[PDB]
């Protein structure tokens, strides 16, 4: 019980597909391009997560302040509740003071 009685199907990985064979290209565009472009501008992803990093609390304010007006009603309510809980936990709880 709790373990499979047969071997899982073997997995095949293409180490030389288009994405793997050219990962990291243009990451030094700023150094080698007279600083006309920043490697941060190559970041592809969420609007509030482009060239920025922070803890869970900080990510919630940044999402709310930038795209909060466009979120769904249920999602906005949950995001507001998450900020309230995170604010209480970080500013009032912990081993260290």
């Amino acid at each position: 019980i709790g373990i499979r009685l047969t071997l899982p199907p073997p997995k095949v990985v293409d180490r030389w597909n288009e994405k793997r064979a050219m990962f990291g290209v243009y990451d030094n565009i700023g150094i080698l391009g007279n600083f006309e472009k920043h490697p941060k501008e190559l970041i592809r992803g969420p609007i509030w997560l482009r060239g920025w990093k922070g803890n869970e609390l900080q990510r919630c304010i940044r999402k709310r302040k930038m795209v909060g007006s466009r979120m769904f009603a249920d999602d906005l309510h949950n995001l507001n509740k998450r900020i309230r809980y995170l604010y209480k936990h970080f500013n009032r709880h912990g081993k260290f003071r």
């Binding site: 373990i3 499979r4 009685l5 047969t6 071997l7 899982p8």
Partner: peptide, 26 residues
């Protein structure tokens, strides 16, 4: 179903050892 291969591989060797002990070859 839990993703992973080593645990299943180890289990297969253990079963084969039991199968070998169940009816040892001449």
């Amino acid at each position: 179903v839990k993703k992973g291969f080593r645990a299943a591989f180890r289990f297969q060797k253990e079963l084969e050892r039991q199968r070998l002990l169940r009816c040892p070859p001449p």
